[PDB]
Write a protein that binds this ligand. Sequence first.
Ligand SMILES: [Ca+2]
Ligand SMILES: [Ca+2]
Ligand SMILES: [Ca+2]
Ligand SMILES: [Ca+2]
Lengths: 612, 612
Amino acid sequence: SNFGVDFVIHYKVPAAERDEAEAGFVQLIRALTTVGLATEVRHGENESLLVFVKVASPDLFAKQVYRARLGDWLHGVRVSAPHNDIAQALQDEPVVEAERLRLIYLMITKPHNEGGAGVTPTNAKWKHVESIFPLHSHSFNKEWIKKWSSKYTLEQTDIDNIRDKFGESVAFYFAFLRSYFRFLVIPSAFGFGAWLLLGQFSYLYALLCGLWSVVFFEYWKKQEVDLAVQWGVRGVSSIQQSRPEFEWEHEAEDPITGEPVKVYPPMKRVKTQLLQIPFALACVVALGALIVTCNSLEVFINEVFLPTIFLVIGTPTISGVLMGAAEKLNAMENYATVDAHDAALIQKQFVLNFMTSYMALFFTAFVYIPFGHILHPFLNFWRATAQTLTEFQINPAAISNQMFYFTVTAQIVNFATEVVVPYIKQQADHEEEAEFLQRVREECTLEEYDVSGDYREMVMQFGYVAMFSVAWPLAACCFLVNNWVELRSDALKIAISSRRPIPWRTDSIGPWLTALSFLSWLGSITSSAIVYLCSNKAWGLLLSILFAEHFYLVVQLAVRFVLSKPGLQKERKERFQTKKRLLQTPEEMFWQRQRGMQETIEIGRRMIEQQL
Amino acid sequence: SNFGVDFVIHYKVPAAERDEAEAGFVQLIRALTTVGLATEVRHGENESLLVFVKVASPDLFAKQVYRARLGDWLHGVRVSAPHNDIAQALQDEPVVEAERLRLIYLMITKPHNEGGAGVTPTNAKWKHVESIFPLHSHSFNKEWIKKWSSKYTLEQTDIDNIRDKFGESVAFYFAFLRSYFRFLVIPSAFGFGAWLLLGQFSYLYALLCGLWSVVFFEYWKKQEVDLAVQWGVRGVSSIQQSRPEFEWEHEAEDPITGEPVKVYPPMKRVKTQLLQIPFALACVVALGALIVTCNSLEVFINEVFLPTIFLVIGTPTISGVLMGAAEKLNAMENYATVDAHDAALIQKQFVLNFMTSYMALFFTAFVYIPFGHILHPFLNFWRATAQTLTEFQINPAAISNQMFYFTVTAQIVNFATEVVVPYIKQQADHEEEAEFLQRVREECTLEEYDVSGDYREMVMQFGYVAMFSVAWPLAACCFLVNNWVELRSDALKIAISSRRPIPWRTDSIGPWLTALSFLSWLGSITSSAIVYLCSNKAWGLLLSILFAEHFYLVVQLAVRFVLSKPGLQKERKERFQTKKRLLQTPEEMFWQRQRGMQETIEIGRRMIEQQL
Ligand SMILES: [Ca+2]
Ligand SMILES: [Ca+2]
Ligand SMILES: [Ca+2]
Ligand SMILES: [Ca+2]
């Protein structure tokens, strides 16, 4: 439905600095025109000038895509270079929309040293440029949402459509979510089969959960490389993309393969990097104190679960401000590549969300149950406060109720915040095309969509399954429905409540693979510990931990060995085919006695005859 | 000193079947001549006919080496194909002796389908051919032994000489031995610094040994790939070399990249493969019974260490017969590739030698010390036997004496058997060249040298260091001297007491990498267990095991992370250099308003001016 547009830039302007903005606009448009993109300017809103661009000459676009395909080829991404004749390259393997959008964005963003015109709104003097974004297509979305909501199971072609259009990382996230939702059936079924017929806090369920977690992790790891090979996006993690916000002080010549490269003394970076530990300790101390007071108030009411519900409802705000502070801190220290910078924010975000999510259960299952004397002083303080306003309690198992109140009453709140609140906030010259202009203006005021949060939510849901499902086997039953709803909720959020993300290629899901392994390993211990501490000396607990951890390790080894036996065979066949295609006195006087071959047999026969 | 000879074949003949041997000899020589190798025949000993061959026409040899280099190139071994002009290929990168010997052997051994003439003495009717082997060079050995024995530390060039001449696997074994001997200094020094000033059975020593084992293993793993890249022998493990002794029943077409390939139903192979477990259990039961009686006799003398010494002296024979039985069993089941067959024999050999070496210490440190009531019945039986020939003993720590008697009195015996006994056994027409013929005849009666046993001995010495050095910190002190002696003892055994092995390329040391990791992991637990059980309830032992194992895991992770930061950079530079070398109504009526670029700036300026 769009007018053939490709990219839109905002370029807000000030009121007391309009003189300094006209020169910047002139420089920006002059740089943009030299690259070879067709541009147009239209009135925006609240001091904005929308700039719409696409590629003008298809010949230059073909040259650029050929150069990009070549550059991918020499980096090992491809295994078949294209011929130096642009007649079948876009015919046998036509360019997809995502690839064209990525190439246009790379041409717009890269500096002159590579073939582009650097207009990054952060590094250089482009302080007036707000954001560069592509446009949506309502015709595609109205059909996609209905098609996805009118079915039950998503086939491979449904994910391939998102890969073709919406990019690569989004496709990987959706494939991972679909695979995880499909795999969640087994723990759901075998927890429903143990919640009604296998007593409470069964020991078999913990081992079964550990085995299922290992199997799912390894199967997803295999399907990951399979999908990477299928989409031809394997090995892109090796490409070290640079960053525009990087800062340096001097250029250091590289002895081997030397081009001008910027460097940062590692000692200076570490001097700021180690600041994370004191900040993490200071934040976790305060959060633990808050949890302690909340649980003390909750247990005081037993002497006459509201504090737990209030804490769950109120923790999103503190989590958000702490996450914003962590994001701000990551900018204080500098990263050269964009992979390292993105792999460092994920670690901090995961640590913070883990400590703000699992610690409420940890302080109730591993602290209050073994020895509740720690909460004694808090109980006494609360009793004294209640008395001034005008004996011994032993909890049998509070983990069962807390897990239910942390799953059922938290999934609803999370879904409400994710869907309904944006839905409610969504209701808060001049020729015959102004509808498109109004749509564009309403599009640029939204927020850029990032897959980090959606990955984090699913990672921590998997953790909740891994380390705490033994206290409530019905958790997977609710999680199945929640994930089925989420598979369309996230699609809707992408479609209507967020601008279309810039397609970025990625081989893997990122550093989340290590997080899943760590969560599974820790769950393999915590589940058995909870089973022992709830089912009721101290010698047996360590033995149970031994059995659980070593069974987990043995299961991991066995599953790896089994799965060591797809797209790898197709790649090997292609490599073999291309290989076949490219395929097309003591010396002079010693053996002078026996020159030819015929007499040697005669000599041997004579030797045999004489031997007898 | 040799007469330019390259390979020697034996071809023994019978007395009642000489008629059937002449035809085989004629066929063998006819097949050999067609390939293009110069041959000669000389009288052997006890019904043998020595056949000496080398390459005849250097042009055919150049063609063969070019074809071999190409075939290596398309398999990813190389990163730079040679040009189709044989003028500088042997000049810039001249062929080494080992490569020429390997190529000649491959030409001799391979069937006609690849370019050779299959003369394997096992599969086909070549029942008369005994062995095909290359000849030594006494001039090289007399200098090499003296040079190695006249120095202290072996530099890289010394190993590179063996790589150039004696092959690849031998060079890898010698490099591994040198690196391990160099790394053994640290545990030796810090055990000498703890045997005199840190009491007995120190807890710090176990953690230090675990850390040293992890560091050495990871450093060797890095140096392994470094040496593989340096020698240009990286990735050869991917090449699946076939086997001549393989048997099949029919040929199954391969759908993808289909050439005639022989197959074996996996169920039939497994039906014989699972027989290992009952055999292993039956052998370990008998060996454990023998150990139990030996230790009972040893402890009975205390009521008035000879049985331990007798058992150590007598165990080589039982180990040898059991190893021969295991080798015979491996032939009963069939393996297609030569890598899988060699990787299966190593597992059985390692398991057998582990159970015949470490179990004597295991039954004394983990069974008798915690509860000696198991040896009660044996003590009573021995006492009854002694009485018929015509109260309670608690051992404080017998592991300290047993470790000394299993190290000092076993290294001497092993060295004697390895060196002195072969030395003693070494003293047990007709023109002016018969000295060479006598040397050749005395050469072919020796035994083929294999690096499996030398790898196994060092692996189990490393195990003894890993899991039992805490009971005797001076073990590394003796092991340093033993390894320094062995570094020349094995070279001498190769030089004089064994025929020159056929040079076989190998990227890695083999499956021994997993064995080292398993030994280190098990030692990280056993050392702490011994420390607790010797230093003196049952609750603390599991906690100590927790601390030891998790410290080992954390140290492994930290060392891997540290070492993640050589030849890989050189390979990347070569790849970059070769890459650089190969490098050289709603549409028509919308933007028709703003065709060029000059008027767009004017329009934007007018919009800005009107906006205010
Ligand atoms: Ca949600
Ligand atoms: Ca979500
Ligand atoms: Ca020896
Ligand atoms: Ca040896």
